[PDB]
Design a protein around this ligand. Structure first.
Ligand SMILES: Nc1ncnc2c1ncn2[C@@H]1O[C@H](COP(=O)(O)OP(=O)(O)OP(=O)(O)O)[C@@H](O)[C@H]1O
Ligand SMILES: Nc1ncnc2c1ncn2[C@@H]1O[C@H](COP(=O)(O)OP(=O)(O)OP(=O)(O)O)[C@@H](O)[C@H]1O
Lengths: 708, 708
């Protein structure tokens, strides 16, 4: 056996890095990004419970107990993961491989191979330990193309064009060398004119080849950009709301906009690499035929250039990864700053926002200064190396001329061959900047492959039939958001079928998350939500959100025409149906006074529309969808009595086919209804009808008396 | 005089273009951007009333009457602007300059100048005319540096470095030519080694000079980008919310990010232009000394290159302006699509939101393909011209060698001089892409140069006297948003001083714009808003927003820590005051249960906070500001019973120093208050106290009876 460890790449989430390191220690050479993302890493630091769950799903026999002071154990099972409080800063996760008698081997990825004595061990940490051992499910073993395959003919044509251009250049160089070698002391004017005409024809042929080469390179880049953009965006929509809550808007906006670099750079780099490969293949044979000493000198120069580029390849990513993830932060701050235009001016804090944006610009630009300084230094070093190589080549040519080995035509041919070889040097210089494509590909694939499980695989629906009607119910449902005490602690609730039930409660008493669970926005940990003797986990997710709607309080009016916003979702809608819906939800008398009936272009999100009017419009839009089960969180008319219509028409229009769940902020708005459900401290405290709850004389009656 | 006209650049709003054209016809060389902006151009088209208002404010004596069929008028005052219904498509605006007997000269911006008689003149249009004449308020006359001035030493150093590099190159070329001319067949090994060492030393000096020059340009571009970005953001801050309502968020975000190139290309192009100027200055003298025929050939080649680059110089902007304006629209739609992630998934319409994005990508990429095809074509013709010039130069050199005019060393010197001259050709090729910076500079001066700057221009207060606070009142206030009937028609309202007054109404009855006017968000057209015998137009705008707050219903929680959000605006706040405020607005018992007291990092806008809880937090934040005049819009805790506290503590805590305006959606929540103000159809319909209004038995009583 030998010592092996994996170092740190991220900054805040070192626990996932430690888990990956122990994974490859047991022999799982899997990408750390995907494993880290399905571990469930937190920005502020996931606790040991998430790590235990990640070990369980990986196939480990993990168990978490406070760290034993006696770290000289014998029946112990290595390696181990433990917590440390580094000089009273935070809790960091470290791994220990093999104790012998006295040496504590800690493989901290932060700063390399670490070696503390027990004096430091007793000083740093306080308590924490997870005993991870494989459960034989965690099994050992030494465990893009489609886009290239759709343009095989174009790739072949581009390669043929590059080969033709290289052949034309080689033929022209050979003809020029032969003319110089033979027709030197010729003194012929017509021959010179004919040679000039031939050279002009060769140049015209080269231009003709360059036409097709450049046009097809641009066309290939176009299609590659289209494919990658479309795939990313399609995958970026199909995510659960948890990823949206976790990340900012700008950290998503900036990732998509970075394709402009990769498309152009890859389009250029493919042609450059093909041309360089062809040129090197020709040049190697040409040099081998020509001479050995000149070939040796050229090989030495190429080896020096390759040594330089290999030595300085690593540092480029170290700057690019900072540039990208600081530009992302700049965009994320600026988007939010612009969006809250009303609030920023309302409290008159413009200069503070300006100074914050100045700080963001200053850091994003100080990073760029270094990222350009490295490029300039490398370019200058490469140019100096090229100049030294050219001086050496000139000296060698002079020595050969003095010795009489090579002739003037041979010197010209050697110069042409050296230029052809240095074309690969220019290709290597360009590929030095291909790290700019590598970093953007790795950054954006970081949520393409890792989050792929969240797209549809995590659903695991597998459902035989469709739709629902009846009654909803809960069974031992425990739901938590993470880093917080559970809000849905223990619910035993069965809503009566086809009745107007309502849920009242207090602020922070989970009045919404209860409805959020029904839409399968977040999956519950324990228990299940049953509908007509079924389960949410065993029903198609499309019908789950298609048959039941949800009128969120923060209504989001989508940009475009009114007809599109009303028709969003269920497409192919006749105008008569939406007219009936608007009359049903009081959205027809409103639309009459607008300048263009159902043809007004709404800018941004209801900018030219009143907030109460937008709330009414959202209810109308939901009533278009014809939901069987409806959920209204207050936000009904928001105009005092008028709200009588926008519900009474529904209940009268229901004809007992639908059921309604009213998350009612304002008590006494729900009096003549089937049941009232209070949940406090997670548990369903008291339930019953209005008269029954009033006669009960509990906390419900106390709150009612306090209200009035 | 002579005929002059202006061509159309936009598509939908040609009236602003016609107004600008008639402005230059009367001697106004102002950018059409600002004029088009304060004309009030709509996506569909502004009527004649807005154009008349624009003429009045610009200083043109305009009057709008239906067009006279008898268009042979003699007492008339040309030029004229008239509307036309072009073959029953839309209402376009045209200008007529001079009529002789049977001549109509339509200088249509869309299709240039056309000549028509009355044969078609009566056929096309139906009715409309505006008679614009200079009222002598308009006047005739032929109506960046700081950033360059702060880097004079750096610019001088860069110029000196470029001159040193040019001198080193010239000295090396001259030494090489002299060595070839003198030591052609000397065959001295020591002399060759010494010459190689000297050439290597010269190359090292040139490499050092290029290194220093490159780092100079990099740091100069750094500072230029910093200054320009910082300037733009501040100017994008104090702009009327009108600008925010009119424009999308992406059309603002894409402008700021556009600097990424302008900075880099300008930094490169400054050094390139300086080097090219120095090289051309040297080369002209060198060629004049050398020979005339070679100088004539070089001048002809340079003229051909200039002609070919100038012929296609204008078309590049015609593509870049499309590229930028389409990328802006892509970002504007995609940002909204991402930020409405809840609503998109609520109705499960991810399919449509992908197809629309695919269409946007397709158009923004076809435009890019065209704009790259133009670049490739121009580059290919430039390369072909360069190759032809090189062939001609080789033929001329061969002819001179045959005639015996120039020698081999002279041929090498001529080749070096030709390379130095063609360096300016490469500089011109690079400056061909400087249109990419010119277009973004123009697009962004379309905002920087052309903006309202609400602080500087719209205010015009210049208040030296201390602000006075008391009862508020309205005087003949008429306020409209544009293209709509006025919402604030005619108000004669005087709020009692230091009393709890409330304003109730119906949806679409200006239930907020009335308060929006007080904050001087939009300036009223007629009348004024008086405070303690003063006016809003004659009070400092900072105090107007510092002394009175506004709790918007769409609360915007600003990203960061809770302490920052509470302390936003009024900085330097002691913790005791915010604790008192939170206890005053019920925001302390909330903050206790959170994991970190006043130190929780909020993602996005209240993502990990309850909606209602964020609403309460906004009220607490407003109560920090200690406003003398307060405006609530329901949205007080929204928990019914608890709301009693979050107002009663304020009124008890006010001690009559403050006054409160309650825009109350829910009637019967305001019973024990000073006055109730109903505004209907713009006018104040009925006012009075609760008992007085009940005894009045009007529409107020009818609505009360209908409510319950
Ligand atoms: N991502 C999250 N989503 C929802 N609630 C969260 C989240 N993170 C933390 N929480 C907390 O969990 C609780 C759930 O609040 P919930 O959204 O259910 O309230 P609500 O229905 O808006 O309350 P109210 O009675 O004021 O109307 C709150 O205390 C909230 O601050
Ligand atoms: N920029 C704008 N600001 C406000 N209203 C606008 C604007 N543009 C158009 N409108 C329209 O003008 C009318 C004025 O509405 P206003 O904003 O005064 O109502 P509100 O007080 O917000 O409404 P409510 O009390 O019913 O919720 C509405 O029909 C609104 O849609």
């Amino acid at each position: 056996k030998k010592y092996v460890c994996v170092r740190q790449y991220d900054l805040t989430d070192c626990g996932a890095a430690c888990l990956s390191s122990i994974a490859q220690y047991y022999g799982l050479k899997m990408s750390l990004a995907k494993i880290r993302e399905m571990t469930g890493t937190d920005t502020q630091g996931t606790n040991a419970y998430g790590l235990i769950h990640a070990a369980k799903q990986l196939g480990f026999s993990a168990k978490g107990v406070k760290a034993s002071k006696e770290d000289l154990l014998k029946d112990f099972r290595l390696p181990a993961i433990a917590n440390v409080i580094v000089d009273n800063r935070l809790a960091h996760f470290v791994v220990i491989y093999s104790i012998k008698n006295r040496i504590i081997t800690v493989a901290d990825p932060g700063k390399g191979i670490v070696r503390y004595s027990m004096d430091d061990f007793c000083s740093i940490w306080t308590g924490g330990l997870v005993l991870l051992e494989p459960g034989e499910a965690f099994q050992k073993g030494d465990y893009f193309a489609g886009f290239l395959k759709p343009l095989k003919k174009t790739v072949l044509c581009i390669f043929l064009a590059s080969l033709l251009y290289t052949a034309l250049g080689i033929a022209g160089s050979f003809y020029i060398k032969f003319l110089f070698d033979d027709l030197i002391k010729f003194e012929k004017l017509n021959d010179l004119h004919i040679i000039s005409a031939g050279f002009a024809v060769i140049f015209l042929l080269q231009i003709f080849l360059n036409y097709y080469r450049s046009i097809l390179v641009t066309k290939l880049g176009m299609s590659i950009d289209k494919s990658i953009m479309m795939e990313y965006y399609s995958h970026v929509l199909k995510l659960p709301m948890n990823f949206f809550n976790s990340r900012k808007v700008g950290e998503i906006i900036s990732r998509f906009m970075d394709a402009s670099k990769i498309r152009q750079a890859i389009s250029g780099a493919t042609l450059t690499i093909m041309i360089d490969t062809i040129m090197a293949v020709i040049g190697g044979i040409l040099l081998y035929i020509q001479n050995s000493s000149l070939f040796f000198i050229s090989f030495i120069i190429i080896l020096l250039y390759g040594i330089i580029v290999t030595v300085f390849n690593k540092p480029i990513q170290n700057a690019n990864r900072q540039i990208m993830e600081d530009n992302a932060k700049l965009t994320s701050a600026l988007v939010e700053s612009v969006k809250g235009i009303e609030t920023i001016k309302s409290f008159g804090a413009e200069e503070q926002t300006e100074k914050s944006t100045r700080d963001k610009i200053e850091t994003v630009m100080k990073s760029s200064f270094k990222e350009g300084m490295l490029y300039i230094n490398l370019s200058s070093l490469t140019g100096i190396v090229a100049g030294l190589g050219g001086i050496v080549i000139l000296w060698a040519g002079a020595y050969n001329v003095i010795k009489g080995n090579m002739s003037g035509g041979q010197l010209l041919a050697f110069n042409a061959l050296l230029a052809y070889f240095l074309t690969p040097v220019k290709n290597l210089i360009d590929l030095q900047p291909l790290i700019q494509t590598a970093v953007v590909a790795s950054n954006r694939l970081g949520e393409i492959l890792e989050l792929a499980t969240e797209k549809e695989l995590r659903e695991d629906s597998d459902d035989f039939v469709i739709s629902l009607k009846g009654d909803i119910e809960f069974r031992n449902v425990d739901f938590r958001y993470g880093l917080r005490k559970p809000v849905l602690k223990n619910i035993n609730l069965t809503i009566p079928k086809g009745k107007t039930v309502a849920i009242v409660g207090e602020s922070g008493s989970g009045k919404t998350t209860l409805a959020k669970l029904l839409m399968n926005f977040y999956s519950p940990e324990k228990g299940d939500i049953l509908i007509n003797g079924h389960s949410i986990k065993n029903i198609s997710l499309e019908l789950i959100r298609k048959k039941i709607a949800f009128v969120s309080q923060d209504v989001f009016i989508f940009s475009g025409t009114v007809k599109e916003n009303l028709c969003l979702g269920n497409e192919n809608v006749d105008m008569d149906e939406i007219i009936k819906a608007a009359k049903m939800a009081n959205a027809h008398d409103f639309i009459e006074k607008l300048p263009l009936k159902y043809d007004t272009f709404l800018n941004e999100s209801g900018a030219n529309l009143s907030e109460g009017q937008k709330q009414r419009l959202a209810i109308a839009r939901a009533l278009l969808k014809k939901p069987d089960i409806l959920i209204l969180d207050e936000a009904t008319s928001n105009l005092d009595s008028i709200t009588e219509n926008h519900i009474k028409d529904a209940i009268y229009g229901l004809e007992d086919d639908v059921t309604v769940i009213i998350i009612a902020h304002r008590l006494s708005t729900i009096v003549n209804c089937d049941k009232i459900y209070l949940l406090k401290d997670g548990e369903i405290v008291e339930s019953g009808s209005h008269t029954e709850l009033i006669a009960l004389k509990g906390c419900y009656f106390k709150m009612w008396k306090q209200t009035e």
